[PDB]
Design a protein around this ligand. Structure first.
Ligand SMILES: CCCCCCCCCCCCCCCCCC(=O)OC[C@H](COP(=O)(O)O[C@@H]1[C@H](O)[C@H](O)[C@@H](O)[C@H](O)[C@H]1O)OC(=O)CCCCCCCCCCCCCCCCC
Ligand SMILES: CCCCCCCCCCCCCCCCCC(=O)OC[C@H](COP(=O)(O)O[C@@H]1[C@H](O)[C@H](O)[C@@H](O)[C@H](O)[C@H]1O)OC(=O)CCCCCCCCCCCCCCCCC
Ligand SMILES: CCCCCCCCCCCCCCCCCC(=O)OC[C@H](COP(=O)(O)O[C@@H]1[C@H](O)[C@H](O)[C@@H](O)[C@H](O)[C@H]1O)OC(=O)CCCCCCCCCCCCCCCCC
Ligand SMILES: CCCCCCCCCCCCCC(=O)OC[C@@H](O)COP(=O)(O)O
Ligand code: NA
Lengths: 296, 303, 306, 303
């Protein structure tokens, strides 16, 4: 069941592809749940806490190094800074190698890489950004800072991966995943269509000014969504009536309707997916247990 | 059942009048739903994808009116003998042809259906909106030839209305189709009710505030109404004017307005839309199924 | 129908429509078949148009009053002369009509109070519209009193009356099931959720504003009113977080502002939204029944008006 | 009621009310018929009146304290010969007296109950909050006499804490009591989870941005953190600086932060609050009843 050395039920269920109809519900059987919970507390609950603390420390060291950066390449302060930079690069390459090892070991069907285990892809992409930032730094360029800030943001965001192992916060993270995947996606598609259409209309209306550029008008229109719109950002054009009509149409369509609809849909989805989000967290904790077990 | 060429069950159900009690729920019968799904997957899916692809492409031939629109004034304009002006003119011709085609499609629908003149404005909003877009394009053309400067506004309206109309092509996918159906229900019911009440409240408080002040740039009704509306979008000032008297009265009026609209009616709208979401799931799925059925039957009749 | 419609002593429909709020389940009384069918019949026969006629005349009155108010002269030291012009004639006759309407509303309110004879304990949840209209009428009358007393406070009173008149159009939402239900939802929410949230939020606002103004030393924002307004301005999504800099202990100022923001904007407003959602999910049936009872009260009052 | 209300050694009321949180069903106990009839009898009999008097005197004390602190003049300060200065001094003396009184009441509670060092941070939030308010007041007094300006900061902290703590007296009013209990539950669960996630995201993106920014006003971590936080209150700027080498990266980072936090996390917080409110009605009523029982027992035991 758990230690077969030929084929284990735990390995089959946990490492199953998304195709399996009930890869979550079948971990709730009495013996499996009892064994998983007992193992976690026994010798995987404090192995995970140590990993989480080490990652936190690594990220602190990475932030300190990057935040204090001086045509690269470029006292006690400098020795500490270079040591931190080297340690951060050494962590990035470690994550890259772990991701490649996971890619080879699991060898996905070239379909579940895009639908399953988003954590592995995110971590590998963070490592890839860090390595690109290193090569640019050693290749006489300044885009090494853009790559590094991208990697830093992604790494800080990735700390949610460790929210698993704490029940309530694990459920919260699973809910975040579901919401982003379904509701934010639908809303963003519709809202981007609306925003682009109205921004193009307004740009066509505008005759001459600083806001002829499609980017400028799109930014100004998006400014409404964040409660910072202007509604008078420009007055260099004819037919003010048409401009105000278009602006009011956009406001009513996007701010007064789509965002409130997003709130309502989020409420409904949260009301719907409590038990599924509990089962998904349980399975995410089972995969963590088995990965920790196999890492030796 | 499906095609007797005289009066088939699917044809009558799909073209049902609004007065029919449960026009939406008829398709749920197993043979009918299984027959629509099979026919779609068999030959209508690719046709619909092609139509959406060519439609969005056709609209995009004119969404670059920014780069197109000259600024010389008093059209018509001249031809520059450059590749750029060749692209501009061919795009304009392609945008006018599209408008004429959509106008005639609407006319062909209107005549063939021969509506009883009541369900026209109650159901089938998509084709009315497409016809309005065609009308706005034709008006742009006629104004353009007539040496007038209102063609820019007329094409801008058409452009915006077409970009929003892509929401029609949103159908054909269960998730986004049902999302569009929910948007339709919400904008018809909750937005209309809230808009009526909020517009009454805003007009009242705007007239009160305008009467309060004495003179300045905000003396007009329109300007003060705009300032009061700016509270709703999260940009309210609370001190937009100084040339007045009775600061107590002005402040208390602004507070009453804010508390009554921003902190009450918007949250009421959120709650009502939430309960509507909770209530119109299966209804919104059935309506999407009926929309797909109408599209399939129209494609069949398109030969 | 004998002993149901009208007896000159007591009829069940009149009793139900005018029943005191203290009755346990006065709302469900209308649910029985004969009452529902008969009220629908009377409305569709006569009161449907009569109510629309009471919503057409009132709208005309309010438009006339607003037109008179907006075009008012600004010269000071009232009253003012009646110059020879069509505009002056029209505005003065509009003023006369508006004052007459105010007097009419004043008299109707007095008559209702004298006939119903309320206990002065049920004039908040009951006869809400009556109190609103009477207060509007009172504001108009005091406006006139100031006007002919040679005081400029008539402008303030008249603008208050105008605001109440325009916002009282919701009374006429009855006669349309969806609009009437929405209006009664507004009234219930105002009665419960707005009043609870406002009390808590006001306590928080006053506390933090007093703390901040105590911290400040001198300047424009040294007063309690200006600081209270600045703190309130966060709630409408236009906070500053840096509105003042003439003080000491920037850390304390930042801590207080962040604490206030987290406690109010992030917690209490989203809590109000959640409670409103729950209530709305809970108040459909009673909101329908209350609308039906309000409908019946309108029917009975129109019938008794003869 | 023999050995239920008064026993001098142990009774059902004093055992249930003062039961540790380790007790499984501590809340549901008071719903038993005779207990519910006895608590409501004692309350109506006298505890309502004593509680109302205590609330009124506390409100008077807080008004005095606010007035004294508002008109504050290297302390200490002398006594100017004027009525205003005498009233200020007597008011601040009264405020200090109230502070020491609350301090000693908190000490008495600690000595009496003798909690197990774990219920302190999970039970009795009100008493610890009152004690912290008193501690701030005493620290303010000692600093004031020690010739420092830090007394102003201490006293403003105490004043704000007291004003927000005034909610303690909302109990004894059913609706406001349930409201306060629900506020307590929301702060413990939803605000905590959201704050954890939001702080993680905010620090990550703020660090990224401040790393991108070359130099200027916002080259410090605190300033950039403040600017990013401003987006949460509907006051983000999106153009607050231009001192960077890559505009595309800056705009992408800001858009990602906005989408992740403002659009997503805030709306999700609203939804989670709605779910919780739907979930915790009966549990919020039971907790209010238990709070009302504790208050009744305390008032009885105070004499
Ligand atoms: C690829 C890119 C897609 C990005 C979308 C965001 C992904 C997301 O939903 O998160 C999930 C979480 C990890 O879930 P898991 O992988 O473990 O769960 C899996 C697992 O296979 C489980 O077994 C399945 O059953 C379960 O269905 C499945 O889901 O990933 C985080 O750790 C939060 C990350 C939160 C941040 C979101 C990304 C932000 C990008 C940063 C951009 C910075 C740029 C500057
Ligand atoms: C004032 C603006 C009013 C806009 C309301 C438009 C309606 C809407 O809400 O959309 C839905 C969709 C139409 O569905 P359908 O016609 O197919 O549904 C019908 C049909 O009978 C179906 O068979 C039935 O089952 C179904 O019940 C029945 O109802 O309309 C679109 O085609 C999306 C286009 C969305 C555009 C909406 C207007 C936006 C304003 C643009 C402003 C630009 C101006 C510059
Ligand atoms: C310790 C610090 C933790 C602060 C978190 C906020 C605490 C909170 O949830 O509130 C609860 C309320 C008092 O509940 P109670 O103690 O009586 O209930 C408890 C318990 O909860 C449960 O019910 C039963 O065990 C039984 O009922 C009883 O044992 O406390 C207030 O009075 C509102 C205070 C609201 C303000 C929140 C604190 C704000 C701090 C001010 C900062 C100012 C700085 C400048
Ligand atoms: C000194 C007064 C300060 C307040 C500013 C004056 C104007 C405030 C607007 C009036 C407040 C009530 C608005 C409201 O929300 O109720 C709407 C009414 O239709 C109630 O409906 P109905 O008459 O009972 O049918
Ligand atoms: Na704002």
């Amino acid at each position: 069941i758990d230690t077969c050395e030929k084929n284990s039920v735990l390995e089959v269920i946990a490492y199953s592809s998304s195709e399996t109809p009930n890869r979550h519900d079948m971990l709730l059987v009495e013996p499996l749940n009892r064994l998983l919970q007992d193992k976690w507390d026994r010798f995987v609950k404090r192995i995970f806490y140590f990993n989480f603390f080490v990652y936190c420390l690594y990220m602190i060291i990475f932030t300190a190094a990057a935040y204090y950066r001086p045509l690269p390449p470029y006292t006690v302060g400098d020795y500490f800074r270079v040591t931190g930079e080297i340690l951060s690069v050494s962590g990035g390459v470690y994550f890259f190698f772990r991701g490649i090892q996971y890619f080879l070991q699991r060898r996905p069907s070239l379909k579940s890489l895009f639908v399953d285990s988003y954590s592995e892809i995110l971590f590998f992409v963070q490592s890839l950004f860090m390595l690109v930032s290193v090569v640019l730094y050693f290749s006489q360029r300044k885009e090494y800072v853009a790559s590094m800030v991208f990697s830093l943001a992604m790494g800080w965001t990735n700390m949610l991966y460790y929210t698993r192992g704490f029940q309530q916060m694990g459920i919260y993270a699973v809910m975040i995943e579901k919401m982003i995947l379904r509701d934010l996606c639908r809303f963003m598609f519709v809202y981007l269509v609306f925003l682009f259409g109205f921004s193009t209309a307004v740009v066509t209306l505008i005759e001459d000014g600083k806001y002829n550029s499609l980017y400028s008008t799109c930014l100004e229109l998006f400014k409404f969504t964040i409660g910072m719109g202007d509604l008078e950002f420009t007055e260099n054009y004819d037919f003010k009536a048409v401009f105000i009509i278009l602006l009011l149409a956009y406001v009513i369509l996007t701010y007064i309707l789509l965002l409130n609809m997003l709130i309502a849909l989020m409420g409904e989805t949260v009301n719907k997916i409590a038990q599924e989000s509990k089962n998904i967290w349980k399975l995410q904790r089972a995969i963590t247990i088995l990965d920790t077990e196999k890492s030796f």
